[PDB]
Enzyme design. Structure first.
Site, PDB file in Angstrom:
ATOM      1  N   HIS B 497       1.112  -1.064  -0.036  1.00  0.00           N
ATOM      2  CA  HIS B 497      -0.094   0.106  -0.171  1.00  0.00           C
ATOM      3  C   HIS B 497       0.707   1.486  -0.177  1.00  0.00           C
ATOM      4  O   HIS B 497       0.277   2.245   0.224  1.00  0.00           O
ATOM      5  CB  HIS B 497      -0.899   0.007   1.689  1.00  0.00           C
ATOM      6  N   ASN B 542      -7.258   0.181   2.665  1.00  0.00           N
ATOM      7  CA  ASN B 542      -6.717   0.321   1.032  1.00  0.00           C
ATOM      8  C   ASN B 542      -7.311   1.398  -0.284  1.00  0.00           C
ATOM      9  O   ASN B 542      -8.370   1.600   0.104  1.00  0.00           O
ATOM     10  CB  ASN B 542      -7.448  -0.629   0.186  1.00  0.00           C
TER      11      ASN B 542
HETATM   12  C1  LIG Z   1      -0.286  -8.058  -5.410  1.00  0.00           C
HETATM   13  C2  LIG Z   1      -2.229  -7.322  -4.039  1.00  0.00           C
HETATM   14  C3  LIG Z   1      -2.521  -5.894  -4.331  1.00  0.00           C
HETATM   15  C4  LIG Z   1      -3.451  -5.566  -3.740  1.00  0.00           C
HETATM   16  C5  LIG Z   1      -4.025  -6.479  -2.826  1.00  0.00           C
HETATM   17  C6  LIG Z   1      -3.487  -8.271  -2.672  1.00  0.00           C
HETATM   18  C7  LIG Z   1      -2.872  -7.689  -3.322  1.00  0.00           C
HETATM   19  C8  LIG Z   1      -1.705  -9.578  -2.676  1.00  0.00           C
HETATM   20  N1  LIG Z   1      -5.133  -6.073  -2.269  1.00  0.00           N
HETATM   21  C9  LIG Z   1      -5.821  -5.051  -2.152  1.00  0.00           C
HETATM   22  C10 LIG Z   1      -7.242  -4.994  -2.203  1.00  0.00           C
HETATM   23  O1  LIG Z   1      -7.778  -5.257  -1.496  1.00  0.00           O
HETATM   24  N2  LIG Z   1      -7.552  -3.189  -1.978  1.00  0.00           N
HETATM   25  C11 LIG Z   1      -6.612  -2.374  -2.780  1.00  0.00           C
HETATM   26  O2  LIG Z   1      -7.222  -0.953  -2.643  1.00  0.00           O
HETATM   27  N3  LIG Z   1      -5.788  -2.798  -2.792  1.00  0.00           N
HETATM   28  C12 LIG Z   1      -5.219  -4.190  -2.389  1.00  0.00           C
HETATM   29  N4  LIG Z   1      -3.898  -4.231  -3.772  1.00  0.00           N
HETATM   30  C13 LIG Z   1      -3.417  -3.421  -4.609  1.00  0.00           C
HETATM   31  C14 LIG Z   1      -3.826  -2.715  -5.317  1.00  0.00           C
HETATM   32  O3  LIG Z   1      -3.589  -3.828  -6.438  1.00  0.00           O
HETATM   33  C15 LIG Z   1      -3.037  -1.411  -6.643  1.00  0.00           C
HETATM   34  O4  LIG Z   1      -3.154  -0.618  -5.972  1.00  0.00           O
HETATM   35  C16 LIG Z   1      -3.690  -1.393  -7.500  1.00  0.00           C
HETATM   36  O5  LIG Z   1      -3.320  -2.979  -8.471  1.00  0.00           O
HETATM   37  C17 LIG Z   1      -2.063  -0.321  -8.313  1.00  0.00           C
HETATM   38  O6  LIG Z   1      -2.832   0.287  -9.929  1.00  0.00           O
HETATM   39  P1  LIG Z   1      -1.593   0.848 -10.618  1.00  0.00           P
HETATM   40  O7  LIG Z   1      -2.629   1.186 -11.812  1.00  0.00           O
HETATM   41  O8  LIG Z   1      -1.121   2.171 -10.123  1.00  0.00           O
HETATM   42  O9  LIG Z   1       0.077  -0.382 -10.797  1.00  0.00           O
HETATM   43  P2  LIG Z   1      -0.749  -1.674 -10.845  1.00  0.00           P
HETATM   44  O10 LIG Z   1      -1.872  -2.574 -10.556  1.00  0.00           O
HETATM   45  O11 LIG Z   1       1.189  -2.079  -9.969  1.00  0.00           O
HETATM   46  O12 LIG Z   1       0.024  -1.861 -12.455  1.00  0.00           O
HETATM   47  C18 LIG Z   1       1.231  -1.197 -13.122  1.00  0.00           C
HETATM   48  C19 LIG Z   1       1.246  -1.366 -14.341  1.00  0.00           C
HETATM   49  O13 LIG Z   1       2.265  -1.381 -15.261  1.00  0.00           O
HETATM   50  C20 LIG Z   1       3.205  -1.618 -15.293  1.00  0.00           C
HETATM   51  N5  LIG Z   1       4.704  -0.684 -15.365  1.00  0.00           N
HETATM   52  C21 LIG Z   1       5.771  -1.095 -14.417  1.00  0.00           C
HETATM   53  N6  LIG Z   1       6.537  -0.094 -15.034  1.00  0.00           N
HETATM   54  C22 LIG Z   1       6.505  -0.270 -16.438  1.00  0.00           C
HETATM   55  C23 LIG Z   1       6.856   0.314 -17.582  1.00  0.00           C
HETATM   56  N7  LIG Z   1       8.325   1.043 -16.938  1.00  0.00           N
HETATM   57  N8  LIG Z   1       6.413   0.193 -18.545  1.00  0.00           N
HETATM   58  C24 LIG Z   1       5.782   0.023 -19.062  1.00  0.00           C
HETATM   59  N9  LIG Z   1       4.451  -0.445 -18.227  1.00  0.00           N
HETATM   60  C25 LIG Z   1       5.745  -0.688 -17.209  1.00  0.00           C
HETATM   61  C26 LIG Z   1       2.893  -3.020 -14.787  1.00  0.00           C
HETATM   62  O14 LIG Z   1       3.119  -4.121 -15.541  1.00  0.00           O
HETATM   63  C27 LIG Z   1       1.879  -3.077 -14.270  1.00  0.00           C
HETATM   64  O15 LIG Z   1       1.055  -4.157 -14.954  1.00  0.00           O
HETATM   65  O1  LIG Z   2      -1.730  -8.904   2.132  1.00  0.00           O
HETATM   66  C1  LIG Z   2      -1.554  -7.274   1.986  1.00  0.00           C
HETATM   67  C2  LIG Z   2      -2.230  -6.988   1.363  1.00  0.00           C
HETATM   68  O2  LIG Z   2      -4.010  -8.044   2.089  1.00  0.00           O
HETATM   69  C3  LIG Z   2      -5.310  -8.168   1.800  1.00  0.00           C
HETATM   70  O3  LIG Z   2      -6.516  -8.109   2.780  1.00  0.00           O
HETATM   71  C4  LIG Z   2      -5.446  -6.584   1.019  1.00  0.00           C
HETATM   72  F1  LIG Z   2      -6.881  -6.240   1.246  1.00  0.00           F
HETATM   73  C5  LIG Z   2      -4.639  -5.562   0.259  1.00  0.00           C
HETATM   74  O4  LIG Z   2      -4.992  -4.329   0.531  1.00  0.00           O
HETATM   75  C6  LIG Z   2      -3.356  -6.059   0.648  1.00  0.00           C
HETATM   76  O5  LIG Z   2      -2.682  -5.422  -0.215  1.00  0.00           O
END
Ligand SMILES: *Cc1cc2c(cc1C)nc1c(=O)[nH]c(=O)nc-1n2C[C@H](O)[C@H](O)[C@H](O)COP(=O)(O)OP(=O)(O)OC[C@H]1O[C@@H](n2cnc3c(N)ncnc32)[C@H](O)[C@@H]1O
Ligand SMILES: OC[C@H]1O[C@@H](O)[C@H](F)[C@@H](O)[C@@H]1O
Ligand SMILES: *Cc1cc2c(cc1C)nc1c(=O)[nH]c(=O)nc-1n2C[C@H](O)[C@H](O)[C@H](O)COP(=O)(O)OP(=O)(O)OC[C@H]1O[C@@H](n2cnc3c(N)ncnc32)[C@H](O)[C@@H]1O
Ligand SMILES: OC[C@H]1O[C@@H](O)[C@H](F)[C@@H](O)[C@@H]1O
Ligand SMILES: OC[C@H]1O[C@@H](O)[C@H](F)[C@@H](O)[C@@H]1O
Lengths: 567, 567, 104, 52
Positions: B497, B542
């Protein structure tokens, strides 16, 4: 209504599609799993730039799609619960466990993959041929004709998979290991690259083959194939094949559409079951073949009595080693090294093309440039050096398959680490069985699979222990064991080389078998099975190439005996 | 040449796509990662029939695509190698470790996901709103206006994600836990369902939202959107945005095609960076913003001096519990029981509509049916019962977010098990930094990320420990801890986060920030950043919904200030 | 059944036990410090051959017990340390501390 | 257990294990300082760590 229906989109099902779609047949294929390898349907999941830059992480992909076949009831004591927490008074059936399963006669490591392309979306891609000792006969009493037929079939199967033995030739680690072992065995054993279903794309990217490679799984007709007819239906659980009263023909395939929830029947001319060794057997038993429930020999089944018996799974021993100081020093044997790394005076040189060099120029240039450009690093091996992929294949005097390699499935530098996997052959025995419960069901409401298995005493057990000792002897020539990866037997069935569940032979009764050499179910005009389940022998090499070869031969029979519909 | 280029295909980049493609802009989106969620591009990987029948396996999918950001040099002593194995005399840089990283000032749990859809292909889908205490101001000097604007933007964001608070209302476990906590904290705290970006499709299948929900990522024009223009380009590493010498505009985007290996320069009117909190910052520093290298206050950067400072990551505490005997008994409180399970005259009955009943009729019908149909099972909770999804949201008196649930991320029956995750807010402090090596590079040859992070010593740390205590106190009302999941702080950054890496404010100087409230980079006409890195406050909830709300606002600005090209 | 195979280690001048001039142990005596590696030639070759011999021999009796798989034990766990005040005929020629009557 | 109870290690090197799940309120040093009777003279990679 279709000419051919195929159950399963793994590599064996795709072999049938490749042959039969190409030959003009109207083909439908069903898979209980879904499309999830990107736009190349059924492709290897390891073929992303990200995994090949982070290959350590691919183990999780594998683990994420291996669902255990039969989990016994858990009897672990947890007696540090709070007094307020609920606790049962017995070890009751919970968390998916199979109450039919004897935990001491299981293949606890056996697992299945329900995704389009099946296990070929994650596999290691090793595709050796079986030698005669491991290989079922396709012709009786003419070894030369039998050899000819197998050579033709394997050659075609190698084409379909894009098998090659060259893709790792410029790895220093590969060569260090192969050349050392060949020296040490003094002509007594032959070492080569593992034959691998793969095409190198660059020095740091290998396109690993899969079901997609055999058949691209795109619906047809399409622009590239305007005269071909193919439909793939993912998320469809195939449940039963319907027998006529004569038990001479299958009349329909009953399916459950997992998305809509509805059930349907599908009519074809030809029915091909390629659902894997476990699930082919399941669908057959659910259709009235063999015997449902706990084996009851007082009441032998009258259809396909050998179904689910003579099952075979290989013993697997594993370790990792850490490359010996001698070997690492040998990498730089041609170098003249002066000074101290990191200081002004340090230099590393070699004479290009010198006949007295041990290594070729490409090797010495890679080593010199690494040593000069990375003076903080104490090893002579370049960072992006491809991994070793070495085998000495099964022989009568060492009746196991070997892989000396790096498989996906941190204090020590990874360049030093080599995996050792030796694979034993298991005697088929009637008592070793895969059966299905007549009351417990699995997650798809089908009869729950249950194993009754132990490695046969006698030759199988003797050889498995000799195989362990062979791994210990051979690995020692390369390095000592890596702590935490000490020589061990792996959980029974973790190897995922189960065979013999629906086994092939010339004569149903004499050969105690379920399909003939055309992979056709005895008695049935239009029912064929494909996969490792067909293989009736004790084998140590990885089985998929052999299963594909049998599938090619089965398709030849279909082409000889069924006419495609007009387009 | 495009009107708009978007870097990153996560839920935030897709928010920009949804808005700008819909407004008629010619949009290109680039992702470094590849399409691998099936035919619905960028969708949730958990949305397969197989994963929802085997939810225990999805943890492996998560782990398989979390690549650690900064791994320090390993100093573990391995002193049981064989004397023949090579060993270095030092703890040298190996196995992709970052020698810049102080292992004691890291976010060791921090990781990134490079796949189309980003982290929304595996996320838990919790999307709570922030209250004023956690949220940046969008309107100064007018709280009611600020509230109204946030409500407008969050309502839109909730529509995009399909956020709901009712999808688990028919779960017995959910209601059991929710009701007990409501009763225990009578008049002190309020409990509700976790707001979740998800749509229920059946009693045993939930369509979890993702990037694909927000925008389907299909190239346009197409049959369904004949007047829209959108292209997605996977396996493209974006490396630099090119600044004019004035530092008032971006002139082009430099990209590296990972399949072909070639590089290109892409032109747009508008550049949007949605590459995540870490990689947005990387791309910017690689493009001349902030400072490359170990930070040097004796030489502050000229451009965006706040970039990579004031970073925030949440403390996270975790445990699991085993449901109390009292709660389990309460599930079947309305039942009349006669006889002994398994006997012919065993009977579990209740009176529908009885005033003395503690539960609704539908609840009792589920309980009676389970107890009668599974007399071998000692629990009153039905087997397919959905998991709990409970929260008490952050308040001044309990300044942490809470989830009392079952997250994807064996002796004890899983029906008994509840997960507890409490999430703390972290004060932004200039000293907490994400920086990028001027000599070490990552797997994509970009400057290696390095953290210099500690939880701030005052309110943040006091609250963190009070938060631990609160989870111990609250969890005890439901049951005792599960052995092996005892109350613990999780590794720093495992929570994913991370915020404040390119933070928002009204005044670049006064508010120590990088973007304004339109998410536009100060000084630059045509550069926008999206994501949690924009969030400048201390928040415990979150962040993704809040990030999306900010992106919607950014999009309004773009629509009002740039003209789409004629189609 | 337990299997323990014990290798011989060549004496080498470089392998030392020494005592700190600033750190002390729990009895306020100069803290012992080792500077030890198994010598690289015969000692190391034999050590690994010894491992192999235990794997070969042990297999004649049964398979390994899971959790007690073939392994080198931590250096010195064997507690058979020698040569720290070693015997010889000639203090100089034989690089030693005591004669054959164990007299210094 | 009797054996283990009277084998006192001869030379224990300075411990560099990373413990990064302490609570934010707990004291932590910024270095791998000499503690718990470890010997700062000892190279952990040229030891007889088993000696007692
Ligand atoms: C892993 C995770 C995430 C998570 C979560 C559970 C887990 C295990 N539970 C969440 C939840 O319940 N609620 C919530 O608000 N957040 C939760 N998260 C976090 C959430 O998934 C992230 O906050 C969200 O996905 C962020 O979105 P954003 O669109 O900003 O970023 P991303 O998903 O990381 O996607 C970024 C992408 O860009 C690409 N990339 C990276 N570098 C480059 C470069 N240089 N060039 C081109 N593309 C690039 C990535 O590959 C990616 O797909
Ligand atoms: O593992 C940590 C994660 O766990 C989940 O329960 C949450 F929903 C997330 O927002 C967080 O990224
Ligand atoms: C998992 C694994 C496998 C593997 C390997 C490494 C690992 C980690 N390494 C291999 C190697 O190096 N060489 C080799 O020969 N084999 C190796 N393997 C094994 C190999 O993947 C399998 O032998 C091969 O994939 C078997 O092919 P087959 O086509 O017969 O079966 P499948 O891949 O299991 O696919 C079957 C499919 O059918 C579906 N299915 C199952 N039941 C149904 C029903 N009832 N209805 C409809 N479809 C069904 C599956 O979903 C699956 O896709
Ligand atoms: O995990 C056991 C597996 O490991 C690999 O090395 C093999 F190539 C496979 O054939 C086998 O399935
Ligand atoms: O633990 C190592 C020890 O183990 C015993 O088996 C031996 F007899 C000893 O001589 C030795 O000190």
């Amino acid at each position: 209504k279709y000419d051919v229906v195929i159950v399963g989109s793994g590599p064996i099902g795709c072999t049938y599609a490749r042959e039969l779609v190409g030959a003009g047949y109207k083909v439908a294929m069903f898979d209980i799993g879904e499309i999830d390898s990107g736009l190349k349907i059924g492709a290897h999941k390891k073929n992303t730039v990200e995994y090949q830059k982070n290959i350590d992480k691919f183990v999780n992909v594998i683990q994420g799609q291996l669902m255990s076949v039969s989990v016994p009831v858990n009897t672990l004591v947890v007696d540090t619960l709070s007094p307020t927490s609920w606790q049962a008074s017995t070890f009751f059936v919970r968390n998916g466990s199979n109450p039919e399963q004897d935990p001491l006669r299981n293949l606890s490591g056996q697992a299945v993959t329900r995704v389009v392309g099946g296990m070929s979306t994650h596999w290691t891609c090793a595709t050796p041929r079986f030698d005669r000792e491991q290989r079922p006969l396709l012709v009786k009493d003419d070894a030369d004709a039998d050899d000819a037929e197998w050579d033709r079939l394997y050659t075609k199967a190698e084409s379909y998979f894009q098998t090659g033995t060259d893709q790792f030739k410029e790895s220093i680690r590969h060569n260090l290991v192969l050349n050392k072992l060949t020296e040490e065995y003094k002509g007594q054993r032959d070492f080569q690259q593992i034959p691998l279903a793969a095409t190198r794309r660059s020095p740091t990217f290998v396109e690993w083959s899969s079901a997609n490679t055999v058949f691209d799984l795109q619906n047809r007709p399409n622009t590239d194939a305007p005269e071909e007819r193919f439909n793939l239906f993912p998320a469809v659980a195939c449940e039963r094949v319907v027998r006529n009263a004569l038990n001479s023909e299958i009349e329909s395939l009953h399916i459950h559409d997992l998305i809509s929830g509805d059930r349907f029947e599908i009519k074809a001319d030809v029915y091909v079951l390629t659902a894997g060794a476990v699930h082919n057997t399941q669908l057959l038993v659910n259709s009235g073949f063999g015997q449902l429930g706990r084996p009851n020999p007082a009441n032998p089944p009258e259809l396909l009595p050998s179904l689910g018996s003579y099952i075979t799974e290989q013993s697997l021993v594993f370790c990792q080693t850490v490359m010996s100081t001698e070997l690492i020093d040998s990498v730089k044997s041609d170098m003249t090294i002066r000074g101290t790394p990191g200081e002004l005076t340090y230099s590393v040189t070699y004479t290009p093309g010198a006949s007295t060099n041990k290594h070729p120029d490409w090797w010495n240039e890679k080593v010199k440039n690494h040593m000069m450009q990375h003076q903080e690093d104490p090893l002579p091996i370049p960072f992006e050096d491809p991994e070793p992929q070495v085998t000495t294949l099964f022989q009568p005097s060492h009746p196991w398959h070997t892989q000396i390699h790096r498989d996906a499935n941190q204090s020590i530098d990874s360049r030093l680490i080599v995996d050792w996997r030796f694979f034993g052959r298991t005697e088929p025995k009637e008592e070793n069985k895969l059966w299905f419960s007549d009351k417990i069901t699995d997650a798809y409401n089908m009869p729950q699979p249950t194993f009754d298995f132990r490695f046969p005493a006698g030759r199988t057990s003797k050889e498995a222990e000799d195989m362990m000792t062979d791994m210990c002897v051979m690995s020692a020539k390369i390095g000592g064991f890596l702590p935490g990866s000490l020589p061990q037997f792996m959980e029974p069935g973790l190897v995922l080389h189960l065979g013999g569940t629906h086994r092939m032979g010339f004569d149903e009764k004499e050969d105690n078998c379920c399909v003939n050499t055309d992979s056709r179910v005895f008695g049935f005009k239009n029912l064929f099975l494909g996969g490792c389940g067909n293989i009736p022998t004790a084998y140590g090499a990885n089985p998929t190439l052999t299963a594909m070869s049998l599938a090619i031969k089965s398709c030849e029979y279909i082409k000889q005996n069924f006419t495609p519909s007009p387009f």
